Design a protein around this ligand. Structure first.
Ligand SMILES: CC(=O)N[C@H]1[C@H](O[C@@H]2[C@@H](O)[C@H](O)O[C@H](CO)[C@@H]2O)O[C@H](CO)[C@@H](O[C@@H]2O[C@H](CO[C@]3(C(=O)O)C[C@H](O)[C@@H](NC(C)=O)[C@H]([C@H](O)[C@H](O)CO)O3)[C@H](O)[C@H](O)[C@H]2O)[C@@H]1O
Ligand SMILES: CC(=O)N[C@H]1[C@H](O[C@@H]2[C@@H](O)[C@H](O)O[C@H](CO)[C@@H]2O)O[C@H](CO)[C@@H](O[C@@H]2O[C@H](CO[C@]3(C(=O)O)C[C@H](O)[C@@H](NC(C)=O)[C@H]([C@H](O)[C@H](O)CO)O3)[C@H](O)[C@H](O)[C@H]2O)[C@@H]1O
Ligand code: NAG
Ligand code: NAG
Ligand code: NAG
Ligand code: NAG
Ligand code: NAG
Lengths: 320, 171, 323, 170, 174, 323
């Protein structure tokens, strides 16, 4: 009569590594490394990204004619070929900071801050168009700004204020135009020596035209610089100018959302939820580690450049 | 292995014991077969499960947007940002790999220990009544039907009841 | 005759988690998690913090009347502002590179206020009394910062002023100044006469030209005008020169100082106290006997590592089987 | 668990033994009693203290002011800073949690091992002048008085001295 | 030690045994000598080398220029940078030290385990035919010549073929 | 008759620490800590660093007379300055975005100095010879940067200057210029004739208008005036335009280059040698076999992780007990 003590064996072929030995065959094991993604750009928090298509944030926010663009989004997606941005050449001041701050919002509403109907009685608001910003083959301009110009050989000093009665922050953007020549200066704004001044309770800046013949960009030798600021609720912002001012027409009442970001990718958007987004696709896993992509948005596994993290659960498999 | 049983003095596993992780094979008058030790087996599943859950549930990370955008005149902070991502990369890659290598060795040692403890428990019940015929097998010096076999698998084996008979079979 | 081998058991109800099973009762254990503080803001490495009370750094470093400006402390380990420290720039305007100044003043050794341009003798050709405003009230009356002087036209002529200082101290000298921006051309003239003015400031390393920016801005503290604040650090051997035909708010007091590696600024209602720590938290000070800490992520000093854990107790004894 | 002794073939602990981690219960001609084993208990205390101190003292901490102030036009570096603190937070939380879980397991194994080794040690001195009666208990074949119990404990048991007598009772 | 052999019931090491980590010292009519168990010694070498290599080769590093330069008005990001470098310092220093402390304990435990396993393997073979006289030594109840001795070392000891002789010497001393 | 089981011992005196006990002597062991270097600055990835000698990056890139502009390599893996590298901007002033430039030149795969605006033909209506100073002395005479030309009026007049360069190089072209600020109106007229001047620079990406800021600033290298330095990278196919009525220090030589990601600047007296390394330290190179090092935290390349350990000895053998 005999009694034998022994352990389980099976048809398992799974291998794991130990500090002492590599490629040990065990009866049972579990993977700790997430290496699968769904190839999609999904909703975070149950909220869709803002997808700008062939436009970049500059084109969308200024209202470039090729961009007609929700009241909420969890992050922003641009394509590698999102070229339609600032169609009139010039510097977009603090552009990356603006993009970061528009990356996620809980509330976003465009509104005519300075109604083109009655805002500018002493200036021409119908000539500010350009081949640099075409629409339907004809000269046009940004939808959210107005390129004011003299009427009847006179450009009176302008002074305009807006009081923020939106229960939240207001994003106001404006431009400063710099002619290539003094003839163009006079032709556009009459006055030769001009300024623009913009001030709220926080913000304050004075602008001067910088006239010169610069290299042609989109066939323009002149330039247009773009500026923005966030006006707090209850606060007033004032514009003063004797020329060269591209005035706000549409601004944005908004509620900013913390720490999201921007994805630049051809990956298609889709109606699914994820807790962790990659530019290659979404990741839905309970696993602690991940080797899909270092650049992620959400509550994600940690990125590692491992290709195998297999945890043994069972014992060494010895069928014999 | 650390405890010398698995892949040790017990040189192979049993596909015949699909019953569980650890157990016995007996043979006597009333028959023979593979029976898993439900107690030890179950305890191990419970403990190895908690192990796996620990490694996993403990992660629980902060919501983060990793990517950042810097202009052509912000190369320094851009490289500082890369330094941060790369440093995290090196930390987690090294620690994840070592974690698995070390814990895999410990898991194997664990199973080995469980087997050793089982075998030693039997060996200590019988003492003189059986002999150690190697490969983790015990041959009784006396008849041991089912009621006696189940007894040893209970830790309630009655040494005295068989001590006399066992004495004789040692020629 | 028997001899039994065994292990200890006690009344201990302490529990620990092991990778294999949770909530195991053991005979003895210790906590690796610092989860207690003293609810005070303490001296860091023997050196007290600078508590600004109802003032912020701007108000303190400038002369804001509501601020104390002290005085016997030539050194501090960090700075404390209260969540209700409103008194700063009493005349609305921009404080350039303000956060940088705050970081750079967070910890100094030696800190000497001194009248870089004595009020009585410095400005014989300009009026240094009219420069007050209801924006910066003092005891109800119109006043101004203590560390700056707002010069205006004396009689009806703001002559080009030129004033220079050589750092005779054996340390960095922090110099602050302002540029006033009237709301109207009428006010420019009444204030400085000249209408078209400039201000120029330069050392060996620094050089900036200012020009007044006149416009009616929204009223802040009843002011339509503005006043921008600027600063710089003059090296030990260096000289700093000021030149203006108007609109300059001249330094009156500057600051000699030696800056330390760099601490930080705590904004908290936690009281400051006569205690000593190596790790300071906005909630209070903690000990540095344990490697981890869950009090607060934002610390100053040599601190345990901040974790999210609620307990981290390590078994020292064995499984408690009193049965 | 891992060494089979604690909660194993010695099913429970002794509340009675109040002066050490591992020890003895004796019961002879002149009374019974619990008595800690000093050599193994003190060694363990020394080794567990070294362990606790190691986990604590190896922690180097650079002087650091964690907090930062960025203005409304420095959101990117503000967020970068956040990623740093949060990054450090996930690394230290995960590693602290696993360290404690893992080392606690080791500490318990450690005690179990100590109890095992102690039982084996006494079994070695006794040889067959006593019987193994289970639950970590030895039954002496000879008359083992206090001075005998003392000598078994302190490892200086005199085997041949009692070898004859014990052999008698079988 | 965890397994009670090294510095345990086997009190000291053998300067005499110069060709291996673990082994045997025999003594019989034909004399005495030290012999290293070559198979278990070699297994331990391979496994320890793999341990050493894993701790080393799992460290793969990114190309990085650590240094950064900030001007007198960039003190804040300079301090952010320093916090990053200091943070990596504190994480790597702590993990390095602890890695070495813990793995050193495991390596010593490992050797101990091997020794104990070698002892049980022999004790298992000898069964009745020998006596355990402590200090890791077995005193045979029969006459164990070089050939006999050798069969123990390489695991081909023939218990039955000595039991009869053993039983008599066994009982006289028992 | 006996057989004994036992373990190796030897003459080893090596100790290691274990979590349970300190200074355990062991029969065999290895060190995981790299604690030695080679006291050299080496080639990184088979490419030598750029050693600037007594010059810093400013002096080298502007072409300070005491710096080598003729034989700099066409590529390098990092840059080395010595702690005393003094020769930089010999004419005082601000060097705009200097740290960024340094960073961006740290490592280059291709680098060609060429004459963007050849001196002999570019400036027919201006004086390209009198632009010298005692601030930048050369072979016993007033001199100036080799890579710029300080244009002055020819005869009594300074006509409007307007000139452009089209980058037909295969790559980015680094262009540097200066803006000169005289200390007096008289110096302004003596130099440029015109009292009210401007400089304009613009590419497709870059645009800035400059205005002379005239004032007597503290003397530096004998200069009360100032000269500010600017730069931009002109992408291939783009145009950069220069326009001025005075005060323009014009580009003469520019640098076609291809930048390599990252890398850095080592400031050390440690000598350069013909060695190849994968990890450089300011005090010497190290081998990347081991995972940890305590040589230096500020490294370049693929390096062991820096730690504050003095030793990480890993047991390989067992406890050594010869007695
Ligand atoms: C202000 C203006 O119309 N300038 C054009 C200039 O007109 C001269 C005029 O200023 C002067 O008083 O009299 C002389 C007569 O000798 C000229 O008539 O003439 C230049 C040469 O043709 C033009 O340059 C061309 O501009 C082109 C772009 O035209 C548009 C544009 O599409 O952007 C047409 C728009 O209607 C106009 N917008 C507004 C609001 O007036 C703009 C605008 O002038 C500029 O964008 C402002 O900088 O120009 C191409 O750029 C072409 O390559 C270029 O030669 C001046 O446009
Ligand atoms: C060329 C020269 O020597 N200029 C000095 C100037 O003389 C003027 C003269 O050139 C002109 O024709 O007529 C006017 C009056 O109508 C003057 O007589 O007079 C200034 C006042 O004494 C001098 O200022 C001194 O400059 C010194 C530095 O000398 C250098 C220098 O090495 O930096 C000499 C260089 O030749 C000169 N370079 C050029 C291109 O002109 C520079 C340059 O003027 C300055 O760097 C511009 O900022 O100056 C000392 O700095 C001394 O302290 C100062 O008074 C002119 O040197
Ligand atoms: C995502 O979750 C939201 C609620 O949080 C829900 O409205 C939506 O249906 C979910 N999306 C999908 C595709 O399941
Ligand atoms: C001081 O602070 C109080 C409360 O914020 C404020 O109302 C008052 O105007 C301030 N005084 C000055 C001079 O800043
Ligand atoms: C130990 O033995 C080796 C081998 O002969 C010898 O070379 C060496 O001198 C000894 N070790 C030391 C450090 O003395
Ligand atoms: C120097 O060695 C490194 C790797 O260690 C390699 O990248 C480089 O090519 C070597 N030098 C050359 C020019 O081969
Ligand atoms: C070079 O540096 C030395 C100081 O080391 C200085 O005296 C000399 O004037 C410098 N030459 C130039 C042209 O910068």
């Amino acid at each position: 009569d005999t009694l034998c003590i022994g352990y389980h064996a099976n048809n398992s072929t799974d291998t794991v590594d130990t500090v002492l030995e590599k490629n040990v065959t065990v009866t049972h094991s579990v993977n700790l490394l997430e290496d699968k993604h769904n190839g999609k750009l999904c909703k975070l928090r149950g909220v869709a990204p803002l997808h700008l298509g062939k436009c970049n944030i500059a084109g969308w926010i200024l209202g470039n004619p090729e961009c007609e663009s929700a009241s909420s989004w969890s992050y922003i997606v641009e394509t590698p070929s999102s070229d339609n941005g600032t169609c009139y050449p010039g510097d977009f001041i603090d552009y990356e900071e603006l993009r970061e701050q528009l990356s996620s919002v809980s509330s976003f509403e465009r509104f005519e801050i300075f109604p083109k109907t009655s805002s500018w009685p002493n200036h021409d608001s119908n000539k500010g168009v350009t081949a640099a910003c075409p629409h339907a083959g004809a000269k046009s301009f940004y939808k959210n700004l107005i390129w004011l110009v003299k009427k009847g050989n006179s450009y009176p000093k302008l002074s305009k204020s807006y009081i923020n009665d939106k229960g939240k922050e207001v994003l106001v953007l404006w431009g400063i135009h710099h002619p290539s020549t003094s003839a163009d200066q006079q032709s556009l704004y009459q006055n030769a020596d001009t300024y623009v001044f913009v001030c709220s309770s926080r913000y304050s800046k004075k602008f001067k035209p910088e006239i010169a013949i610069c290299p042609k960009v989109r066939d323009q030798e002149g330039r247009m610089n773009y500026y923005w600021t966030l006006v707090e609720p209850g606060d007033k912002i004032t514009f003063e100018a004797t020329g060269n001012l591209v005035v706000p027409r549409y601004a944005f009442a908004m509620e900013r959302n913390a720490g999201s970001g921007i994805i630049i990718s051809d990956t298609p958007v889709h109606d699914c939820n994820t807790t962790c987004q990659t530019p290659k696709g979404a990741i839905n896993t309970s696993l602690p580690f991940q080797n899909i992509h270092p650049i992620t948005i959400g509550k994600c596994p940690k990125y590692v450049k491992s290709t195998k993290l297999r945890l043994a659960t069972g014992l060494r498999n010895i069928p014999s | 292995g650390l405890f010398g049983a698995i892949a040790g003095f017990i040189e192979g596993g049993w596909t015949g014991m699909v019953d569980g992780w650890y157990g016995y094979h007996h043979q006597n008058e009333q028959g023979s077969g593979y029976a898993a030790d439900l107690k030890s087996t179950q305890n191990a599943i419970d403990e190895i499960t908690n192990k796996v859950n620990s490694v996993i549930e403990k992660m629980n990370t902060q919501f983060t947007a990793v990517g950042k955008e810097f202009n052509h005149l912000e190369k320094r902070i851009e490289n500082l940002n890369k330094k941060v991502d790369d440093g995290f990369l090196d930390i987690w890659t090294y620690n994840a790999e070592l974690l698995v290598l070390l814990e895999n060795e410990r898991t194997l040692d664990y199973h080995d220990s469980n087997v050793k403890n089982l075998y030693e428990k039997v060996r200590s019940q019988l003492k003189n009544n059986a002999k150690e015929i190697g490969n983790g097998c015990f041959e009784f010096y006396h008849k041991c039907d089912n009621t006696c076999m189940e007894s040893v698998k209970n830790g309630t084996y009655d040494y005295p009841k068989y001590s006399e008979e066992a004495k004789l079979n040692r020629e």
